Design an enzyme around this catalytic site. Structure first.
Site, PDB file in Angstrom:
ATOM      1  N   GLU A  35       0.815  -1.206   0.000  1.00 50.38           N
ATOM      2  CA  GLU A  35       0.000   0.000   0.000  1.00 50.38           C
ATOM      3  C   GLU A  35       0.853   1.263   0.000  1.00 50.38           C
ATOM      4  O   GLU A  35       0.590   2.206  -0.754  1.00 50.38           O
ATOM      5  CB  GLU A  35      -0.941   0.018   1.199  1.00 50.38           C
ATOM      6  CG  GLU A  35      -2.070  -1.010   1.142  1.00 50.38           C
ATOM      7  CD  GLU A  35      -3.104  -0.715   0.055  1.00 50.38           C
ATOM      8  OE1 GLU A  35      -2.954   0.285  -0.690  1.00 50.38           O
ATOM      9  OE2 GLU A  35      -4.085  -1.490  -0.051  1.00 50.38           O
ATOM     10  N   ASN A  46      -7.674   9.023  -5.805  1.00 52.69           N
ATOM     11  CA  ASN A  46      -8.481   8.097  -6.597  1.00 52.69           C
ATOM     12  C   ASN A  46      -9.315   8.831  -7.659  1.00 52.69           C
ATOM     13  O   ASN A  46      -9.585  10.031  -7.536  1.00 52.69           O
ATOM     14  CB  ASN A  46      -9.398   7.277  -5.678  1.00 52.69           C
ATOM     15  CG  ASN A  46      -8.638   6.554  -4.584  1.00 52.69           C
ATOM     16  OD1 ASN A  46      -7.623   5.908  -4.843  1.00 52.69           O
ATOM     17  ND2 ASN A  46      -9.117   6.669  -3.349  1.00 52.69           N
ATOM     18  N   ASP A  48     -12.341   8.909  -8.329  1.00 54.52           N
ATOM     19  CA  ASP A  48     -13.610   9.457  -7.866  1.00 54.52           C
ATOM     20  C   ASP A  48     -13.421  10.729  -7.027  1.00 54.52           C
ATOM     21  O   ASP A  48     -14.391  11.313  -6.548  1.00 54.52           O
ATOM     22  CB  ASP A  48     -14.382   8.390  -7.071  1.00 54.52           C
ATOM     23  CG  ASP A  48     -13.725   8.053  -5.731  1.00 54.52           C
ATOM     24  OD1 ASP A  48     -12.494   8.204  -5.597  1.00 54.52           O
ATOM     25  OD2 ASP A  48     -14.437   7.625  -4.806  1.00 54.52           O
ATOM     26  N   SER A  50     -11.762  10.982  -4.123  1.00 58.51           N
ATOM     27  CA  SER A  50     -11.308  10.665  -2.767  1.00 58.51           C
ATOM     28  C   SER A  50      -9.794  10.452  -2.750  1.00 58.51           C
ATOM     29  O   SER A  50      -9.153  10.418  -3.796  1.00 58.51           O
ATOM     30  CB  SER A  50     -12.030   9.434  -2.222  1.00 58.51           C
ATOM     31  OG  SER A  50     -11.657   8.275  -2.934  1.00 58.51           O
ATOM     32  N   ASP A  52      -6.440   8.263  -0.638  1.00 54.94           N
ATOM     33  CA  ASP A  52      -5.977   7.248   0.314  1.00 54.94           C
ATOM     34  C   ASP A  52      -4.802   7.791   1.129  1.00 54.94           C
ATOM     35  O   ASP A  52      -3.922   8.456   0.575  1.00 54.94           O
ATOM     36  CB  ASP A  52      -5.537   5.978  -0.403  1.00 54.94           C
ATOM     37  CG  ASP A  52      -6.637   5.345  -1.230  1.00 54.94           C
ATOM     38  OD1 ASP A  52      -7.833   5.609  -0.987  1.00 54.94           O
ATOM     39  OD2 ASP A  52      -6.285   4.558  -2.124  1.00 54.94           O
ATOM     40  N   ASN A  59      -9.007   5.236   3.002  1.00 57.41           N
ATOM     41  CA  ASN A  59      -9.736   6.045   2.017  1.00 57.41           C
ATOM     42  C   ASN A  59     -10.674   7.088   2.641  1.00 57.41           C
ATOM     43  O   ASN A  59     -11.487   6.778   3.506  1.00 57.41           O
ATOM     44  CB  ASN A  59     -10.544   5.110   1.095  1.00 57.41           C
ATOM     45  CG  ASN A  59     -11.038   5.795  -0.172  1.00 57.41           C
ATOM     46  OD1 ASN A  59     -11.064   7.022  -0.268  1.00 57.41           O
ATOM     47  ND2 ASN A  59     -11.423   4.992  -1.165  1.00 57.41           N
TER      48      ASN A  59
END
Ligand SMILES: [Br-]
Ligand SMILES: [Br-]
Ligand SMILES: [Br-]
Ligand SMILES: [Br-]
Ligand SMILES: [Br-]
Ligand code: NA
Length: 129
Positions: A35, A46, A48, A50, A52, A59
């Site tokens: 990660e 991301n 959309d 959002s 992380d 998220n």
């Protein structure tokens, strides 16, 4: 902070993440590796909108507030910036909430694709625990 492999394993164990919801320490270390590459300051946006955050790339769509994800929730009740600290406490507490949400560690796509079903014990092999 960029953790060492055994250093992170030790820190995760201290915060009671080892065997949490049945997931051994190697699963969590492996998840962190893929990660964030063990970097607490890692961020990724991301498609959309959002973002992380942190060692386990938690998220903002669901789990933290970063002030710029409109439809989102703040289920761990923290600023997303808290997940970027040298101290991994907020990240560990939020992950414990995530891994209990029903889908286990499948919540982490890198875990599913790169750790699940592998020899995850290798990731804590040689560490003094
Ligand atoms: Br490594
Ligand atoms: Br927001
Ligand atoms: Br820590
Ligand atoms: Br992946
Ligand atoms: Br393990
Ligand atoms: Na949010």
């Amino acid at each position: 902070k960029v953790f060492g492999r055994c250093e992170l394993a030790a820190a995760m164990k201290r915060h009671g993440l080892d065997n949490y919801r049945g997931y051994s320490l190697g699963n969590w270390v492996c998840a962190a590796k893929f990660e964030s590459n063990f970097n607490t300051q890692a961020t990724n946006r991301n498609t959309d909108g959002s973002t992380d955050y942190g060692i386990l790339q938690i998220n903002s769509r669901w789990w933290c507030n970063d002030g710029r994800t409109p439809g989102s929730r703040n289920l761990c009740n923290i600023p997303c910036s808290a997940l970027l600290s040298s101290d991994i406490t907020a990240s560990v507490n939020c992950a414990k909430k995530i891994v209990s949400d029903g889908n286990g560690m499948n919540a982490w796509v890198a875990w599913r694709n790169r750790c699940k079903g592998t020899d995850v014990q290798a990731w804590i092999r040689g560490c003094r625990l």
